[PDB]
């Protein structure tokens, strides 16, 4: 079906974002930000809705996403959190930009 086919494309994108091909810049986004471990004691005051690729993967596996739009909103929320918390000249923001380019260009190839 339409939703199934579009969610197959989303699952393909998710696998690519987690693949060794993109590991050099994807690694900050693999797991939830551990604010306490990183000494970022303001992270949860600034970021109300944390998101990361392991959470997107669990939601995809649990059939939480009913359509491609819901999946894309979570992937974009993950990048937006990075752009909100970190100064724009920081290394992690450059890595976010690169992984979001991978995401946006392949998401744009969504089947109709
Ligand atoms: C605030 C935080 C963030 O937005 N993200 C997405 C996650 C990390 C992070 C750190 N450890 N892990 C396992 C992930 C991260 C990494 C760096 C630098 O170390 C990048 O070089 C800087 C800032 C962050």
């Amino acid at each position: 079906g339409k939703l199934s086919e579009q969610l197959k494309h989303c699952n393909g994108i998710l696998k690519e974002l987690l693949s060794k091909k993109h590991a050099a810049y994807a690694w900050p986004f693999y797991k939830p930000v551990d604010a306490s471990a990183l000494g970022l004691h303001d992270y949860h005051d600034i970021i109300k809705h944390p998101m990361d690729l392991s959470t997107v993967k669990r939601k995809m596996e649990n059939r939480d996403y009913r359509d491609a739009q819901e999946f894309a909103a979570d992937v974009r929320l993950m990048f937006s959190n990075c752009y909100k918390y970190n100064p724009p000249d920081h290394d992690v923001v450059a890595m976010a930009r690169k992984l979001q380019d991978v995401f946006e260009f392949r998401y744009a190839k969504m089947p109709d």
Side-chain angles (χ1 to χ4, degrees):
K2 181 228 337 186
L3 304 178
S4 302
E5 184 171 6
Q6 288 198 338
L7 283 171
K8 295 291 184 207
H9 186 67
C10 292
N11 196 48
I13 293 164
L14 177 58
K15 284 289 144 51
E16 178 169 357
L17 295 185
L18 289 165
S19 73
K20 294 157 85 176
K21 183 161 86 174
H22 301 299
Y25 39 94
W27 68 261
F29 309 100
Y30 283 168
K31 296 286 151 64
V33 172
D34 191 340
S36 295
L38 296 174
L40 307 177
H41 301 301
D42 55 351
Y43 189 79
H44 292 290
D45 299 287
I46 292 163
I47 305 305
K48 296 302 204 79
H49 302 285
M51 189 50 57
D52 71 281
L53 293 174
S54 74
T55 301
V56 173
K57 182 167 168 283
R58 178 189 72 51
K59 289 179 73 165
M60 184 63 72
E61 289 172 347
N62 292 353
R63 299 174 75 175
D64 211 348
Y65 299 122
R66 293 201 64 235
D67 53 44
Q69 287 74 18
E70 197 182 345
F71 164 84
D74 268 356
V75 174
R76 288 161 175 163
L77 168 61
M78 178 184 78
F79 293 127
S80 295
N81 290 341
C82 189
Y83 305 146
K84 184 180 193 187
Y85 183 72
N86 299 282
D89 60 333
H90 279 210
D91 297 339
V92 71
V93 172
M95 300 160 82
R97 280 200 199 89
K98 286 166 66 178
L99 195 69
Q100 184 155 27
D101 192 275
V102 172
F103 170 72
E104 293 296 341
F105 276 79
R106 191 165 173 194
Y107 187 74
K109 295 176 177 63
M110 187 69 65
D112 298 318

